[PDB]
Design a protein around this ligand. Sequence first.
Ligand code: NI
Lengths: 245, 258
Amino acid sequence: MQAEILLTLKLQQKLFADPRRISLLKHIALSGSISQGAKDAGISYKSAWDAINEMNQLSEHILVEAVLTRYGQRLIQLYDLLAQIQQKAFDVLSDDDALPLNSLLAAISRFSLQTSARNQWFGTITAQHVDVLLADGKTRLKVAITAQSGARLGLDEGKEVLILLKAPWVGITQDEAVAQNADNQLPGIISHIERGAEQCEVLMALPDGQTLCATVPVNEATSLQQGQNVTAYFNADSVIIATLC
Amino acid sequence: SHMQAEILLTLKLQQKLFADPRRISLLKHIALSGSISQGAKDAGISYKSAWDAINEMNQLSEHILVERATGAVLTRYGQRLIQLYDLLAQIQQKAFDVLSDDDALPLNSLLAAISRFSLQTSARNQWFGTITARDHDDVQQHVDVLLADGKTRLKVAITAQSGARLGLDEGKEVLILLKAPWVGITQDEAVAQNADNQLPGIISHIERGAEQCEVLMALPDGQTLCATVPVNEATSLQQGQNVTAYFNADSVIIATLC
Ligand code: NI
């Protein structure tokens, strides 16, 4: 379904920007002149001046110096942003199976935003740190974070969070006495071990479905076997937690 | 920081005008009033143009926006259209404030909009940048990142595989998520000269606490670096002090859209 968005900006109750003025600016950038610009954009020369002069006055910047100033370019960038996201916005709107729309930036960023952390899990703030319940419903974590960063992330009971944990920040132990003194403990079964000259990648099947990745010094992985039940452990302050609002 | 823009959006579907200010305003007054006719009158539009608008919006969207109360109410879709419109308008208003205030991120970038307006993380550093050419002919397991001045360079560790999957080719936009306690702050160049990454600067703000001192410095592109250093190790620091921030390449997590 063809779909588009048109934007008009008004300042002080008057007309500041509208597609025809943005097209005037872009034809000005292209042509290197106001008169050629107006012609390409389809308006009179005097009307191109009236628009540029009104824009300058209402915004209190200078938009055209012919070249555009920085302020002028970024005004076009603000239009280009809208045009970058419209099709995502229309797809969010037409999504008959979605729950109610809370945050359009969070909706368009839930499934596209990816990270380089090999462990990337979803959770909710359950009731200096916060506790997080993972999405398969049983696993709890403790995440070190001040009351104030918690406030800046919007950490309320139930807020969805993204939890990030590099593989080399994860310890792997077969000793319950080591694991029990860790902040976070995730029992699981080793499903793959890959031994290199300095490092060993461990993948572990967590009881509830996802696969945890740890990267440990090889000499610490010597007795480990695929099939074996072990415990992954990490400090509360190793985890990065993110929210989208 | 002054002057809020008034945002006027028009959505068009199938080459036709679908929703504009007047139509969204009609649907909110319908929701507020409980009826088409009181809602059209509150929105300042006649009864007939009100139903002409709703019949059109239904036909274009392939949904029903308004239905008789089981009195008129918005359906799920009528509510979703108003929500999406108003969130969209709010994103253009915040973008306008960015234009007015300035910053060095591109204002056309979606990742930069997410970073400014939606994403927050516990790491405290969340810098915008772009994948740039490796800075050595030899392949190493790291990407190079330029900050928004297109000049200040960082290295981040990652494998070719996770780099590939994330689409990390020249020009890809990423965020650098770097915990504050993993950032050093030094007045001694040699100390920092031993780390993968050094970012010179000036302390723009210092806060001291019993165990940790928080330091804030402007990166050369305007973005803000935050570091948390042991108060033992921060006793000689002060605002305006010229400083170098330093960190390992494997301390970073890269975020990017895929
Ligand atoms: Ni490099």
